[PDB]
C-alpha cells in the first residue's frame, strides 16, 4: 500500500507538498499518478508519468519522485483547491493490480 | 346515401390515426412474452451486427 499524511493545511497563496512512501515493489519500480477528488464528483487526474500534466491542468501543480517517495506540489493556493488527493501506482509481483493511496485532506485557511 | 332498394347500410366506422414503422406480416410462430427490437416472420432478433 501507499502511505500519505492524513491531513495538511496552509494559508492561501502558499506552497504545499504532499508525500507518500510505498515500497520497492509499488513505487520503486513503477510510475506514480496523482488524482484530485472534490465532494460529489468523480476523481480528476492531475499528474501522470510522474511529472506530466494533462491538457487543462494549471502550471501550479507539479510532481516528482525520488527513490521510494513521491511528492505533489501545489502553489498559489485558492479557496477552490480544498479536496482529497490520492496517489496511485501499478503494483506488480504476485498478481499485478492498481493500488491507490490512503488519501490526504487539504484544508485551506 | 340515397337508395330505393338493395342497400346494405353502414353501421360502424373508424377514425384512423397514422404512424411509422408498422405493417402486416404472415407467420405461423407462436406468441410469447419477450421484448425485442426486430421482428421477422420466423422469429425475433436480438443483435447489433450489420448483416443478417
Amino acid at each position: 500500500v501507499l502511505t500519505q499524511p492524513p491531513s495538511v493545511s496552509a494559508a492561501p497563496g502558499q506552497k504545499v507538498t504532499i508525500s507518500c512512501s510505498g515500497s520497492s515493489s509499488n513505487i520503486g519500480n513503477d510510475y506514480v499518478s496523482w488524482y484530485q477528488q472534490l465532494p460529489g464528483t468523480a476523481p480528476k487526474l492531475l499528474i501522470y508519468d510522474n511529472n506530466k500534466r494533462p491538457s487543462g491542468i494549471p502550471d501550479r501543480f507539479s510532481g516528482s519522485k525520488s527513490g521510494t517517495s513521491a511528492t505533489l506540489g501545489i502553489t498559489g493556493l485558492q479557496t477552490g483547491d480544498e479536496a482529497n488527493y490520492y496517489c496511485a501506482t501499478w503494483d506488480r509481483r504476485p498478481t499485478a493490480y492498481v493500488v491507490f493511496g490512503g488519501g490526504t485532506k487539504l484544508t485551506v485557511l | 346515401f340515397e337508395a330505393n332498394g338493395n342497400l346494405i347500410a353502414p353501421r360502424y366506422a373508424f377514425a384512423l390515426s397514422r404512424g411509422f414503422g408498422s405493417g402486416i406480416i404472415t407467420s405461423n410462430a407462436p406468441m410469447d412474452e419477450c421484448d425485442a427490437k426486430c421482428q421477422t416472420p420466423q422469429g425475433a432478433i436480438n443483435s447489433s451486427l450489420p448483416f443478417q
Binding site: 513503477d30 510510475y31 506514480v32 499518478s33 468523480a42 476523481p43 480528476k44 487526474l45 501522470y48 508519468d49 494533462p54 490520492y86 496511485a88 501506482t89 501499478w90 504476485p94 498478481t95 499485478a96 493490480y97 492498481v98 493500488v99 491507490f100 493511496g101 490512503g102 488519501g103 | 443483435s47 447489433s48 451486427l49 450489420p50
Partner: protein, 118 residues
C-alpha cells in the same frame, strides 16, 4: 468521450447485481476499461479491467472469484456482474478509461457513477 452507467439498484444480501457502462463514439475502442468503487467515508478501490481486441480480463485479489467483467463490442457496452452481496458492498461504482490498450495506474476519463445499496 463520455461514459454513462446504468441506474441505481437496491439488492438483498446473497443476491447478485449486473451493471453496464456505455461509451460514446465508434462501437470499437482502442483503450482498456476499468471498474472502480468507493464506499462512503473511504477511498477508491480498483476491481478489475478489460482489454480491447485481445479480450484479456484482469481482477483484484480481494475481488477475485466474485466479479465477472464482459464486453459487447458491436453495441459498445461493458458489463460487470457481482455476486454474494454483503452489507459492505454498499458503494458508488465508476467505469473509467485508460489512454492505452493496457490496464495501468493512469485513468483520464471517469463516469458519473451509480450507487449499489444492500
Amino acid at each position: 468521450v463520455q461514459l454513462v452507467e446504468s441506474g441505481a439498484e437496491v439488492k438483498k444480501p446473497g443476491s447478485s447485481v449486473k451493471v453496464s457502462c456505455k461509451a460514446s463514439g465508434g462501437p470499437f475502442r482502442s483503450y482498456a476499461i476499468s471498474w472502480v468503487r468507493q464506499a462512503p467515508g473511504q477511498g477508491p478501490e480498483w476491481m478489475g479491467g478489460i482489454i480491447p481486441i485481445f479480450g484479456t480480463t484482469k481482477y483484484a485479489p480481494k475481488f477475485q472469484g466474485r466479479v465477472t467483467i464482459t464486453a459487447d463490442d458491436f453495441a459498445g457496452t461493458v458489463y460487470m456482474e457481482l455476486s454474494s452481496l454483503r452489507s459492505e458492498d454498499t458503494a458508488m461504482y465508476y467505469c473509467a478509461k485508460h489512454m492505452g490498450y493496457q490496464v495501468r495506474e493512469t485513468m483520464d476519463v471517469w463516469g458519473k457513477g451509480t450507487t449499489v445499496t444492500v
